[PDB]
Amino acid sequence: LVHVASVEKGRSYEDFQKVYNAIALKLREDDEYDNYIGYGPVLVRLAWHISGTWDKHDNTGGSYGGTYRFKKEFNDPSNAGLQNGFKFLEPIHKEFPWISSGDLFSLGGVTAVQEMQGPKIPWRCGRVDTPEDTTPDNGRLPDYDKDAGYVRTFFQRLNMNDREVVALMGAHALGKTHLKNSGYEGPWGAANNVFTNEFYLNLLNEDWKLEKNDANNEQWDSKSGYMMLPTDYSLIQDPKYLSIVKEYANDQDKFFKDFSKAFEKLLENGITFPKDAPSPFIFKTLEEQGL
Numbered sequence: 001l002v003h004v005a006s007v008e009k010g011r012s013y014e015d016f017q018k019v020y021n022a023i024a025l026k027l028r029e030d031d032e033y034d035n036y037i038g039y040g041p042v043l044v045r046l047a048w049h050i051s052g053t054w055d056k057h058d059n060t061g062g063s064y065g066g067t068y069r070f071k072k073e074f075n076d077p078s079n080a081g082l083q084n085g086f087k088f089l090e091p092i093h094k095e096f097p098w099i100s101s102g103d104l105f106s107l108g109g110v111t112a113v114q115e116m117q118g119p120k121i122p123w124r125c126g127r128v129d130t131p132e133d134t135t136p137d138n139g140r141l142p143d144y145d146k147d148a149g150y151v152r153t154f155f156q157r158l159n160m161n162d163r164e165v166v167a168l169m170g171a172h173a174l175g176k177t178h179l180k181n182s183g184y185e186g187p188w189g190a191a192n193n194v195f196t197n198e199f200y201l202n203l204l205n206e207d208w209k210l211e212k213n214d215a216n217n218e219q220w221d222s223k224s225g226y227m228m229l230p231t232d233y234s235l236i237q238d239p240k241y242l243s244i245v246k247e248y249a250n251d252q253d254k255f256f257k258d259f260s261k262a263f264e265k266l267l268e269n270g271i272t273f274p275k276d277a278p279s280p281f282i283f284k285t286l287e288e289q290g291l
Ligand code: HEM
Pocket: 041, 042, 044, 045, 048, 081, 142, 143, 144, 151, 168, 169, 171, 172, 174, 175, 176, 177, 178, 179, 180, 181, 182, 183, 184, 229, 231
């Protein structure tokens, strides 16, 4: 498969800036969701999950085709709870009917990070909605109960190296796990709708204890009321991962620069951009525009 980016016909920077302003104004407005966390966290989880299906070997999956709109991918167990991010974005898609799904799903992830005071993420337009038979089979997204060897190996399919995996996992500063969606329960930290290097500081500074939760799964619980998944705790058990965790715990700017590069790489995998395509867009936040 080749997937060539095609700009939505006749649209420029300013049209996409309005779709960004619309997602961001609705983030401000529906601030009550999930006990006042807001929709920001489930929108960057949605952007990672439609992108994390990519397979570098046959170029199938990933964000291009917008295939989460189809029932098979939508009812994948691994995607339980994402229906809330989809429901949020659907009024915005009725308002801007010209934007493709893959561009809407991935721009939601970019708007959420920058409006939660994260770094600027360069974004590119150009995904095209492809048919229901290009929709990937379930089982391409990662298990929760595993170790650092599984983590390295899984991310090799999307060809992320060690630094990119650790920068990307820092998004777990946001949101929380929910027992009814995944079988795990609890937040990774305290400021869970602000984007900081907190996930790394907690992994290193808390006194984690292994215990079973009410679903019968294991997780690392700390005295402060925080949790860590087996896959998150893996990052201080592996000597290569642990040096990068420490680097981000000591330097938030270095984490912001690396997360920014790795998150755009995640959202662009499997997509060929023609040299005539526009440069990546840097959107202004509500606040920078005075809105
Ligand atoms: C080995 C990799 C990963 C595993 C096993 C994993 C697993 C999970 C699980 C089990 C949840 C909670 C689901 C629920 O109960 O609602 C979750 C939530 C979340 N994940 Fe990860 N994750 C991984 C990677 C990532 C990456 C790379 C990103 C983003 C760049 C990400 C972003 C999020 C966010 C923001 C949430 C919070 C969602 C909410 O509050 O509803 N995850 N993840």
